[PDB]
C-alpha cells in the first residue's frame, strides 16, 4: 500500500486523578479494537463518568474532549470490585465507538464519535509539540497522581482495617494511627508530593501492630 | 554543550507477572534520581526480590539483567500494604545505585552498578530494533499480565469477603461464588486472556449478593 490510515493521536479516557489513560496508542492502523477493565473509586459507587480524550498530554484537561457520558446502575459493592469494561472500537470508516459495560449488572452505555471529530491537522502538531515541550511537567503530574492514589488506597484500607480490628487494636496504636490518617487526609487535599509520602510514611510507622492483626484475621 | 550523557535504554525493575517497570526512561540525562513505591503480592509476605533491568522490552526476561538482591524483614501485613520504596539514582560518574526501603520497618538494601555494566553499543541497537519489531507482541503480553493481576486481585479479594461475610451469605450464593473462584484460579494458571476475563465475568455475575454484604459491613 502507498498509504496507511492511522490515528494521529492517542485516544483514551480520563481516570481517577484527572489523568488520560490511553486505550488506543498514537499511530495505530484502523480498524482496531482495544479494551481495558476499570473499577469504582468509592464504596457503593452507583455510576461512573466516561470521558473520551484525544491527545498525548498526561492531564486529561490538556487533551481534546471528544464527549462524555455516564454508565449507571452499578450495584452496591466495595470500591475496586465492579468490572467496568471500556472498549474503544474504530471501524474501517474511522468512526469511534466507545462503550462501557458493567460485567456484574450487564448494563452497557455508549458514545459514537465520527471520523471528523477531534483535532485538525495543525492542532495534531501543536499537540505533538506540546507533549514534547511539557514531558518533564507531565511526568511529574503523573507521579503526583500515582502518589495521591496510593495515599488514598492506604487511607481507605487502613480505615477498613481499624474497623475490622475493633478491640484487638490497643488504645495507643489506635490514637496514633487515627492522627496519622488525619494528617494523611489533609495532605491528600494538596499537590505536594513529598508531604503525601511523609504522611504515608508516618502511617507505615505507627501501623505495625494493626498490620499484624489484619494479616492474622 | 556539544554533547550530552544519556541513558541509551530504559532502566527498571521486574514487577509481578514478569514485566519490566521503568524507573528511569530511555534518553534521560544524568545525573538523575527517580523513585516509586511498590508493595507485597501476598499476605504476610516477609521479603521481595528486586531485579534490576536495562532495556525496552515488556517481558522482564527479554531485557538485560543488571543484578538482583532481596530486601527482607518485611513485617506481617495484608498484601499491598507495605510501602517498598525503590529508588534509582545515577550520579555524575554514571554509576547506578538501586535501593529498596521498607517505610514500616525502616530496613534498606542496595545494589550498586557501574557505568560500564549492561549492553554495549551494538546491543543497545539490537534492543531498540527488537522493541520495535515486537511492539504488538509486547503490548499483548502486558495486557495479559494486567488481566491476570486483575483476576488475581478479584480472587484474593472475594475470598477475604466470603470469609468476612460468614453467615450473611446464603448457601446458594456461596456455592456459586466458590465454584466461580475455582474456575478463575484454574484460568489464572494459563495464558489465555479471554478465559480469564470469562471467569472474572462469571464471578461478577454470581457475586451480586456478596458485594452488597461487603459494602454494607
Amino acid at each position: 500500500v502507498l498509504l496507511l490510515d492511522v490515528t494521529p493521536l492517542s485516544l483514551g479516557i480520563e481516570t481517577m486523578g484527572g489523568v488520560m489513560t490511553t486505550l488506543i496508542a498514537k499511530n495505530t492502523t484502523i480498524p482496531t479494537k482495544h479494551s481495558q477493565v476499570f473499577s469504582t473509586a468509592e464504596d457503593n459507587q452507583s455510576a461512573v463518568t466516561i470521558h473520551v480524550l484525544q491527545g498525548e498530554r498526561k492531564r486529561a484537561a490538556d487533551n481534546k474532549s471528544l464527549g462524555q457520558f455516564n454508565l449507571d446502575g452499578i450495584n452496591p459493592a466495595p470500591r475496586g470490585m465492579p468490572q467496568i469494561e471500556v472498549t474503544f472500537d474504530i471501524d474501517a470508516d474511522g468512526i469511534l465507538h466507545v462503550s462501557a459495560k458493567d460485567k456484574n449488572s450487564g448494563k452497557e452505555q455508549k458514545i459514537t464519535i465520527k471520523a471528523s471529530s477531534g483535532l485538525n491537522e495543525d492542532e495534531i502538531q501543536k499537540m505533538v509539540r506540546d507533549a514534547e515541550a511539557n514531558a518533564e511537567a507531565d511526568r511529574k503530574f503523573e507521579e503526583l497522581v500515582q502518589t495521591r492514589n496510593q495515599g488514598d488506597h492506604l487511607l481507605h484500607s487502613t480505615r477498613k482495617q481499624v474497623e475490622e480490628a475493633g478491640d484487638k487494636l490497643p488504645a495507643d496504636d489506635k490514637t496514633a494511627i487515627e492522627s496519622a490518617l488525619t494528617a494523611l487526609e489533609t495532605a491528600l487535599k494538596g499537590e505536594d508530593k513529598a508531604a503525601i509520602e511523609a504522611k504515608m510514611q508516618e502511617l507505615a510507622q505507627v501501623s505495625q501492630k494493626l498490620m499484624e492483626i489484619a494479616q492474622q484475621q | 554543550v556539544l554533547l550530552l550523557d544519556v541513558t541509551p535504554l530504559s532502566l527498571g525493575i521486574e514487577t509481578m507477572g514478569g514485566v519490566m517497570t521503568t524507573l528511569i526512561a530511555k534518553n534521560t540525562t544524568i545525573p538523575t534520581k527517580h523513585s516509586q513505591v511498590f508493595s507485597t503480592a501476598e499476605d504476610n509476605q516477609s521479603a521481595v526480590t528486586i531485579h534490576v533491568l536495562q532495556g525496552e522490552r515488556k517481558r522482564a526476561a527479554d531485557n538485560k539483567s543488571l543484578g538482583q538482591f532481596n530486601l527482607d524483614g518485611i513485617n506481617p501485613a495484608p498484601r499491598g500494604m507495605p510501602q517498598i520504596e525503590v529508588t534509582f539514582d545515577i550520579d555524575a560518574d554514571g554509576i547506578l545505585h538501586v535501593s529498596a526501603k521498607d517505610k514500616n520497618s525502616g530496613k534498606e538494601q542496595k545494589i550498586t552498578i557501574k557505568a560500564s555494566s549492561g549492553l554495549n553499543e551494538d546491543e543497545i541497537q539490537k534492543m531498540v530494533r527488537d522493541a520495535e519489531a515486537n511492539a504488538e507482541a509486547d503490548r499483548k503480553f502486558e495486557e495479559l499480565v494486567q488481566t491476570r493481576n486483575q483476576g488475581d486481585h478479584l480472587l484474593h479479594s472475594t475470598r477475604k469477603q466470603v470469609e468476612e461475610a460468614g453467615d450473611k451469605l446464603p448457601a446458594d450464593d456461596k456455592t456459586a461464588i466458590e465454584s466461580a473462584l475455582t474456575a478463575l484460579e484454574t484460568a489464572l494458571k494459563g495464558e489465555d486472556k479471554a478465559a480469564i476475563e470469562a471467569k472474572m465475568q462469571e464471578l461478577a455475575q454470581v457475586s451480586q449478593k456478596l458485594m452488597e454484604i461487603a459494602q454494607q459491613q
Partner: peptide, 8 residues
C-alpha cells in the same frame, strides 16, 4: 460521577 480507576 467519579472517573474509573485502573482496576487493581
Amino acid at each position: 460521577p467519579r472517573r474509573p480507576v485502573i482496576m487493581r
